Ligand binder design. Structure first.
Ligand code: SAM
Ligand code: SAM
Ligand code: CU
Ligand code: CU
Lengths: 85, 97, 97, 95
RNA sequence: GGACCUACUACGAGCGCCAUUGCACUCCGGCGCCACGGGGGGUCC
RNA sequence: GGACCUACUACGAGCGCCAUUGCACUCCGGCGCCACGGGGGGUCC
């Protein structure tokens, strides 16, 4: 149950800056977001981390937006293995 | 109200968002329902918060209205209707895109 | 008519039991907001009718927008705003339960 | 991943009774054609999930096509084609 | 088998809490409470 | 400083292909094509 949530199976064809703002459009409803980091690197291409201020927010986001088709690709959300700053 | 058009009219959108972000962010959510032709956005920030999403088939518009209704988009739940008939083009020609 | 918080649904599948129908309607209309009651007409002359009563008018409007003509039990339901004060007058006269 | 006769639904509202869910799904998916069975298990492994078995794949295709992401009991369902065939389907074909 | 009872028992049903996003078609996650129902026990017809 | 050009250079921005389902919080997978932009290089008013 980390604050940060780990999203993968994202549409890799989307630019990093566009993707960041597109994710904020959906996850802003759940609470205060601090940052959304997206690497378009080979190691972390279809992936993103969304950091919520409260754990209630991250839980509600994982609860609700699981399997949501994002750019026609359904997102796979997990709790992050490690805690964020 | 309206009849099943292939275009849907979205309003009650967050006016604080730039036009470029909104067009692209709407595509992120509504692309799942089918092929999108255009995404038109009210060009007046004073009275913005409106948008048109033009689908190829009416099936896409219908399914989109059912599912994404009341969806919190930028923490504001959007209000989706069927667009009036051939009205998506009227505002495009008249310059509100 | 005028935007009521209650919506009047008719053209319902008559073969369906009252208990199943109420619960199946709740399955679809819960997304639009909080539902107070779901009234179903147990009359033979005035059969195939139902009332879904919402807390907020915003909920009923989105429901009419989206679920209009929705094939429910293979029969497309036809939604209108309830005529003002009809639901209660129906709940009193027992025609709806 | 390929047009199966059954569709696999998950992200269902777990609080709903098995028979209510079975009947509520039939209320929605009967429009697409004749349904053979709707399998529902409220067990830890298979809860929040359902299988809808159609006679024709055309019905199943239209069902995934139309009702995808549809909020059912305020929870939007996520529809897939089933991986395997259903046992009732298998006998028709024999496998 | 009816009617009032009970220093007993959560078995059904019914509420909530936690956990689970899981591809099945040989039951079956874990708690807390419990209207009505069972099981035991007692007093009459 | 304007106008047309380059046996040159993919530095941006923009397209596609193959491969990858990967848990981060300094950084970088491989090709092919390139509108419009820069860098270098010329002929002119
Ligand atoms: S009843 C009695 C019925 C009567 N004994 C009979 O056989 O017809 C018992 C009541 O006590 C409650 N009860 C059941 N099990 C219980 C337990 N383990 N502890 C406390 N109360 C219980 C139930 O709610 C039920 O209404
Ligand atoms: S003006 C320069 C033009 O040369 C083209 N260009 C830039 N680099 C190039 C290269 N390495 N090889 C061939 N053409 C190039 C650009 O498309 C630009 O429009
Ligand atoms: Cu007893
Ligand atoms: Cu140059």
């Amino acid at each position: 149950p980390n604050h940060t949530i780990y999203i993968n199976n994202l549409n890799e064809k989307i630019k990093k800056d566009e993707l960041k703002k597109s994710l904020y459009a959906i996850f802003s409803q759940f609470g205060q977001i601090l940052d959304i980091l997206v690497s378009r690197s080979l190691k972390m291409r279809g992936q993103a981390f969304v950091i919520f201020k409260e754990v209630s927010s991250a839980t509600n986001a994982l609860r609700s937006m699981q399997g949501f088709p994002f750019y026609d690709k359904p997102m796979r959300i997990q709790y992050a293995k490690t805690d964020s700053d």
